[PDB]
Amino acid sequence: KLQDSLDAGVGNLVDADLAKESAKLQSLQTKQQLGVQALSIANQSSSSILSLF
Amino acid sequence: KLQDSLDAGVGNLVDADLAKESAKLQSLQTKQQLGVQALSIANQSSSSILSLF
């Protein structure tokens, strides 16, 4: 029983809560796609003034 | 008569009541099958979160 308590305690210290990680994963993948889109938007700034010449 | 009394007394000290043991045996066999089923139920916990990924 003591060995089981020590192993369960190690699990309490280090184990991930995977149900929480699934939500973090979905939101981070959306955030990464939005960041790529935002970088594409920022990349376009130089071409705006080409029309002035 | 004294030898018979001593032998019957040893039987009073150590002999099992087998009619009582038959009931304990049936209930313990049911309890063991239920424990195997409960362990199977506990074994399934990790697979529940596979659906989240």
mmCIF file of C-alpha atoms in Angstrom:
data_model
loop_
_atom_site.group_PDB
_atom_site.id
_atom_site.type_symbol
_atom_site.label_atom_id
_atom_site.label_comp_id
_atom_site.label_asym_id
_atom_site.label_seq_id
_atom_site.Cartn_x
_atom_site.Cartn_y
_atom_site.Cartn_z
ATOM 1 C CA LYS A 1 0.000 0.000 0.000
ATOM 2 C CA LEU A 2 2.869 2.399 0.734
ATOM 3 C CA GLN A 3 4.468 1.714 -2.644
ATOM 4 C CA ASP A 4 1.149 2.432 -4.343
ATOM 5 C CA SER A 5 0.817 5.682 -2.374
ATOM 6 C CA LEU A 6 4.310 6.786 -3.390
ATOM 7 C CA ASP A 7 3.655 6.001 -7.052
ATOM 8 C CA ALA A 8 0.312 7.813 -7.031
ATOM 9 C CA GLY A 9 2.033 10.770 -5.370
ATOM 10 C CA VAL A 10 4.680 10.903 -8.080
ATOM 11 C CA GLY A 11 1.834 10.933 -10.567
ATOM 12 C CA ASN A 12 0.244 13.811 -8.675
ATOM 13 C CA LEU A 13 3.491 15.737 -8.959
ATOM 14 C CA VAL A 14 4.369 15.235 -12.628
ATOM 15 C CA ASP A 15 1.439 13.907 -14.705
ATOM 16 C CA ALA A 16 -0.302 16.105 -17.256
ATOM 17 C CA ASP A 17 -4.075 16.553 -17.269
ATOM 18 C CA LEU A 18 -4.646 15.559 -20.877
ATOM 19 C CA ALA A 19 -8.262 16.708 -21.023
ATOM 20 C CA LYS A 20 -7.048 20.241 -20.278
ATOM 21 C CA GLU A 21 -4.212 19.869 -22.795
ATOM 22 C CA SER A 22 -6.654 19.010 -25.591
ATOM 23 C CA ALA A 23 -8.340 22.395 -25.181
ATOM 24 C CA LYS A 24 -5.005 24.183 -25.038
ATOM 25 C CA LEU A 25 -3.907 22.370 -28.195
ATOM 26 C CA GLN A 26 -6.957 23.373 -30.220
ATOM 27 C CA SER A 27 -6.750 27.003 -29.177
ATOM 28 C CA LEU A 28 -2.995 27.185 -29.827
ATOM 29 C CA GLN A 29 -3.406 25.739 -33.321
ATOM 30 C CA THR A 30 -6.001 28.408 -34.080
ATOM 31 C CA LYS A 31 -3.686 31.034 -32.609
ATOM 32 C CA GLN A 32 -0.820 29.834 -34.812
ATOM 33 C CA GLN A 33 -2.919 30.077 -37.971
ATOM 34 C CA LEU A 34 -4.002 33.570 -36.952
ATOM 35 C CA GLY A 35 -0.386 34.515 -36.324
ATOM 36 C CA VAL A 36 0.623 33.378 -39.790
ATOM 37 C CA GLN A 37 -2.246 35.434 -41.225
ATOM 38 C CA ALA A 38 -1.230 38.471 -39.154
ATOM 39 C CA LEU A 39 2.348 38.146 -40.370
ATOM 40 C CA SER A 40 1.066 38.023 -43.946
ATOM 41 C CA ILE A 41 -0.870 41.215 -43.281
ATOM 42 C CA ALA A 42 2.202 42.919 -41.827
ATOM 43 C CA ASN A 43 4.299 41.778 -44.817
ATOM 44 C CA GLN A 44 2.040 43.767 -47.168
ATOM 45 C CA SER A 45 2.887 47.209 -45.781
ATOM 46 C CA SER A 46 5.691 48.046 -48.212
ATOM 47 C CA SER A 47 3.536 47.485 -51.288
ATOM 48 C CA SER A 48 0.954 50.110 -50.294
ATOM 49 C CA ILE A 49 3.196 53.026 -51.324
ATOM 50 C CA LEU A 50 4.109 51.553 -54.708
ATOM 51 C CA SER A 51 0.948 53.210 -56.030
ATOM 52 C CA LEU A 52 2.318 56.672 -55.208
ATOM 53 C CA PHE A 53 5.092 56.314 -57.777
ATOM 54 C CA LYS B 1 -14.043 -41.235 28.671
ATOM 55 C CA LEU B 2 -11.340 -38.696 29.553
ATOM 56 C CA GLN B 3 -9.478 -39.370 26.310
ATOM 57 C CA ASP B 4 -12.696 -38.834 24.368
ATOM 58 C CA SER B 5 -13.309 -35.567 26.239
ATOM 59 C CA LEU B 6 -9.805 -34.323 25.447
ATOM 60 C CA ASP B 7 -10.164 -35.204 21.765
ATOM 61 C CA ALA B 8 -13.576 -33.546 21.514
ATOM 62 C CA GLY B 9 -12.108 -30.484 23.226
ATOM 63 C CA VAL B 10 -9.285 -30.281 20.706
ATOM 64 C CA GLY B 11 -11.947 -30.425 18.026
ATOM 65 C CA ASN B 12 -13.791 -27.588 19.741
ATOM 66 C CA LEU B 13 -10.618 -25.522 19.645
ATOM 67 C CA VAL B 14 -9.462 -26.052 16.056
ATOM 68 C CA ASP B 15 -12.177 -27.547 13.808
ATOM 69 C CA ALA B 16 -13.828 -25.479 11.096
ATOM 70 C CA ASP B 17 -17.607 -25.202 10.809
ATOM 71 C CA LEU B 18 -17.876 -26.286 7.193
ATOM 72 C CA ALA B 19 -21.520 -25.304 6.770
ATOM 73 C CA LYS B 20 -20.518 -21.708 7.522
ATOM 74 C CA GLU B 21 -17.498 -21.997 5.218
ATOM 75 C CA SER B 22 -19.695 -23.017 2.276
ATOM 76 C CA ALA B 23 -21.553 -19.704 2.496
ATOM 77 C CA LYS B 24 -18.317 -17.765 2.833
ATOM 78 C CA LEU B 25 -16.921 -19.583 -0.201
ATOM 79 C CA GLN B 26 -19.862 -18.757 -2.455
ATOM 80 C CA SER B 27 -19.887 -15.102 -1.478
ATOM 81 C CA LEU B 28 -16.108 -14.763 -1.867
ATOM 82 C CA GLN B 29 -16.206 -16.290 -5.349
ATOM 83 C CA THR B 30 -18.856 -13.756 -6.346
ATOM 84 C CA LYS B 31 -16.768 -11.000 -4.773
ATOM 85 C CA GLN B 32 -13.704 -12.110 -6.744
ATOM 86 C CA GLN B 33 -15.583 -12.019 -10.046
ATOM 87 C CA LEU B 34 -16.886 -8.561 -9.181
ATOM 88 C CA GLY B 35 -13.369 -7.442 -8.321
ATOM 89 C CA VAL B 36 -12.068 -8.597 -11.684
ATOM 90 C CA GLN B 37 -14.916 -6.698 -13.358
ATOM 91 C CA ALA B 38 -14.184 -3.582 -11.287
ATOM 92 C CA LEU B 39 -10.517 -3.767 -12.244
ATOM 93 C CA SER B 40 -11.537 -4.012 -15.896
ATOM 94 C CA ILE B 41 -13.652 -0.900 -15.437
ATOM 95 C CA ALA B 42 -10.769 0.968 -13.809
ATOM 96 C CA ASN B 43 -8.418 -0.131 -16.620
ATOM 97 C CA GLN B 44 -10.589 1.710 -19.166
ATOM 98 C CA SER B 45 -9.995 5.212 -17.797
ATOM 99 C CA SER B 46 -7.064 6.129 -20.042
ATOM 100 C CA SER B 47 -8.971 5.416 -23.249
ATOM 101 C CA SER B 48 -11.728 7.938 -22.495
ATOM 102 C CA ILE B 49 -9.549 10.934 -23.427
ATOM 103 C CA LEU B 50 -8.335 9.442 -26.707
ATOM 104 C CA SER B 51 -11.464 10.930 -28.282
ATOM 105 C CA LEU B 52 -10.309 14.465 -27.440
ATOM 106 C CA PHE B 53 -7.346 14.185 -29.801
#
